Design a protein around this ligand. Structure first.
Ligand SMILES: C[C@H]1O[C@H](O[C@H]2[C@H](O)[C@@H](O)[C@@H](O[C@H]3[C@H](O)[C@@H](O)[C@H](O)O[C@@H]3CO)O[C@@H]2CO)[C@H](O)[C@@H](O)[C@@H]1N[C@H]1C=C(CO)[C@@H](O[C@H]2O[C@H](CO)[C@@H](O[C@H]3O[C@H](CO)[C@@H](O[C@H]4O[C@H](CO)[C@@H](O[C@H]5O[C@H](C)[C@@H](N[C@H]6C=C(CO)[C@@H](O)[C@H](O)[C@H]6O)[C@H](O)[C@H]5O)[C@H](O)[C@H]4O)[C@H](O)[C@H]3O)[C@H](O)[C@H]2O)[C@H](O)[C@H]1O
Ligand SMILES: OC[C@H]1O[C@H](O[C@H]2[C@H](O)[C@@H](O)[C@@H](O)O[C@@H]2CO)[C@H](O)[C@@H](O)[C@@H]1O
Ligand SMILES: OC[C@H]1O[C@H](O[C@H]2[C@H](O)[C@@H](O)[C@@H](O)O[C@@H]2CO)[C@H](O)[C@@H](O)[C@@H]1O
Ligand code: CA
Ligand code: CA
Ligand code: CA
Ligand code: NA
Length: 481
């Protein structure tokens, strides 16, 4: 019954065009381990073959056309992708496609555009008069032609860029001039107006653009048979646009598409604003939780575990939180590097997978490892936790986040799941024990640690209490197995 999604990719995967095939053959395995949904990497053609996909060139080229010097994307061909999706569907796994609508990179040609420079630290302040720049805003898709879509992009479909091919100046942000041209609103306010991020910034004020992206969303959904979306860089996209784009796609497909937005800011208030402005119609990644987990793993035991959920989305708005430990941006060497340390990682996964609130996600990089950066596969430590979530994490939850090192919580289980119920106990410091209530109906049961970290057993007393133990800097998940 408990759902668990998996980000099926990491930044440094090899550019071998065999990822779709890997996913294909891993389908049955994932389902057996408790994975119920998979978030696939960008499926379209990037600025180059080895682009992870965020340098989004052509959203209609899913590794089907000869563009950018390659037919396949970094992950494989459209055929292989569709074969992987079918495999997932046949194994009862939902498929969430990534969605990049903030910008377009790898333009086919440049155009002469009138623009003014703006202050990178306050995009609402123009710092130069108007003049002509050479911007990469033209997309004709020579390898695709009009297949799937005849829509062509020009400078007027964008709000600006950060590169003038005619002068090649650094640290500049250009806001295009013209009828109705201005940064979109509402967007995040860091830097005054955070509409601009990278590449050619799409203008959500243009009717042709809104119409086109909505039509693409429908095409994308119907073509692959997607069950949901992972929406990229939403704090840089007109809030109402994303809200209405999701509503449009759900309506046009007659499907209640799941959606998780990436609003990257360690600030609950900003995320709450985003949720209210989008009418709570979709979920968001719990970025604050990720930082709490990260900071805890870097505090050498001095983090106050009692506050592990303070300021998080899962604590405040559990129904709209997608909890994750790490991702492709937080992994080593990447843009948002803040990788949760290996010793703490099992605790982090226990914190997201065994509690009743939030929609947890497993990171491919953590599960299978990141060989390029020395990160070992941790599936051996994650699998026992996934099994705990699948079979035992059910029923009423009792919290015991009452100590700076040792915290824990129990689940009383429900009749819908046999022998369900559990007692998670962890310590970011010295080991110990904690008495916790698991339910009077469990009296006499002899519980054991599904993680295997502790080898003994814990007998629930006549009143439903068990004295659970945990080793130092570790987590134990006691269950009636
Ligand atoms: C990654 C993350 O970033 C953002 O997060 C911010 C955050 O907003 C900010 O607040 C802060 O975060 C703090 C929090 O607020 C705090 O609360 C917390 O406590 O601390 C935080 C840490 O400070 O900082 C964060 C990081 O900055 C954003 O909000 C997140 O959403 C975002 N994560 C998601 C979003 C992504 C965007 O899709 C995605 O990013 C990925 O992938 C990106 C794309 O690869 C990558 O971007 C980087 O690399 C780009 C490519 O190098 C670079 O682009 C520039 O350079 C290009 C040239 O290479 C330019 O292109 C143009 O010029 C070229 C020449 C043209 N090419 C021509 C020429 C040719 C030569 O002959 C031809 O061959 C070609 O065919 C032609 O086309 C091209 O067409 C032109 O367009 C381009 O204009 C330049 O912008 C980017 O600038 C650079 O950033 C990211 O690194 C990577 O992470 C995330 O993965 C996704 O999860
Ligand atoms: O004269 C150039 C012209 O460019 C833009 O007009 C675009 C318009 O935005 C598109 O929707 C489409 O209709 O193509 C037009 C160009 O033929 C500017 O918006 C406009 O102000 C400008 O005059
Ligand atoms: O739709 C407006 C709605 O917003 C709030 O309700 C949120 C709630 O705060 C979230 O935690 C979650 O439960 O989603 C709800 C929206 O479905 C307000 O609390 C509510 O009064 C208001 O109607
Ligand atoms: Ca605009
Ligand atoms: Ca934008
Ligand atoms: Ca501590
Ligand atoms: Na814009």
């Amino acid at each position: 019954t408990n759902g668990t999604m998996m980000q099926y990719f990491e930044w440094y995967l090899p550019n071998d065009g065999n990822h779709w095939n890997r996913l294909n053959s891993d389908a049955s395995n994932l389902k057996s381990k408790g994975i119920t949904a998979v978030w696939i990497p960008p499926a379209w053609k990037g600025a180059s073959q080895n682009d992870v996909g965020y340098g989004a060139y052509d959203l209609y080229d899913l590794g089907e056309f000869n563009q950018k010097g390659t037919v396949r994307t970094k992950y494989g061909t459209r055929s292989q992708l569709q074969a992987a999706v079918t495999s997932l569907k046949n194994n009862g796994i939902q498929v969430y496609g990534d969605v990049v609508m903030n910008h377009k990179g790898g333009a086919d040609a440049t155009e002469m555009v009138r623009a003014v420079e703006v202050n990178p630290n306050n995009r609402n302040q123009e710092v130069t008069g108007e003049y002509t720049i050479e911007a990469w805003t033209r997309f004709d898709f020579p390898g695709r032609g009009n297949t799937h879509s005849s829509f062509k992009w020009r400078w007027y479909h964008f709000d600006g860029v950060d590169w003038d091919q005619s002068r090649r100046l650094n640290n500049r942000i250009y806001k295009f001039r013209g009828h109705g041209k201005a940064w979109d609103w509402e967007v995040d306010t860091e830097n005054g107006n955070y509409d601009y991020l990278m590449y050619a910034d799409i203008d959500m004020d243009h009717p042709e653009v809104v119409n086109e992206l909505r039509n693409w969303g429908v095409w994308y959904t119907n073509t692959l048979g997607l069950d949901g979306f992972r929406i990229d860089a939403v704090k840089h996209i007109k809030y109402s646009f994303t809200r209405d784009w999701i509503n449009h796609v759900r309506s046009a497909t007659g499907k209640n598409m799941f959606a998780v937005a990436e609003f990257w800011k360690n600030d609950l208030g900003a995320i709450e604003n985003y949720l209210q402005k989008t009418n709570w119609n979709h979920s968001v990644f719990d970025v604050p939780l990720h930082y709490n987990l990260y900071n805890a793993s870097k505090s050498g035991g001095n983090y106050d575990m009692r506050n592990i959920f303070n300021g998080t989305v899962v604590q405040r708005h559990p129904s709209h939180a997608v909890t994750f430990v790490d991702n492709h941006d937080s992994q080593p060497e990447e843009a948002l590097e803040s990788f949760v340390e290996e010793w703490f990682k099992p605790l982090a996964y226990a914190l997201t997978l065994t509690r009743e609130q939030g929609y947890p996600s497993v990171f491919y990089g953590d599960y299978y490892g990141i060989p390029t950066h020395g990160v070992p596969a941790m599936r051996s430590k994650i699998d026992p936790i996934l099994e705990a979530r699948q079979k035992y994490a059910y029923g009423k939850q009792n919290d015991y986040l009452d100590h700076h090192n040792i915290i824990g919580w129990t689940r009383e289980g429900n009749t819908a799941h046999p022998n369900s119920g559990l007692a998670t106990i962890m310590s970011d410091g010295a080991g110990g024990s904690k008495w916790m209530f698991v339910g009077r109906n469990k009296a006499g049961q002899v519980w054991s640690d599904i993680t295997g970290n502790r080898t003994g057993t814990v007998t629930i007393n006549a009143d439903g209490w068990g004295n659970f133990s945990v080793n130092g800097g570790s987590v134990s998940i006691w269950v009636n197995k």
